[PDB]
């Protein structure tokens, strides 16, 4: 399972779309 790492994605990228 990966319900951290997957979203780690989601989060490095949920940065990079706000700036």
């Not at 399972?1 to 700036?19: D, H, N």
Request: glycine fraction near 0%.
């Amino acid at each position: 399972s990966a319900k951290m790492r997957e979203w780690f994605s989601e989060t490095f990228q949920k940065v990079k779309e706000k700036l």
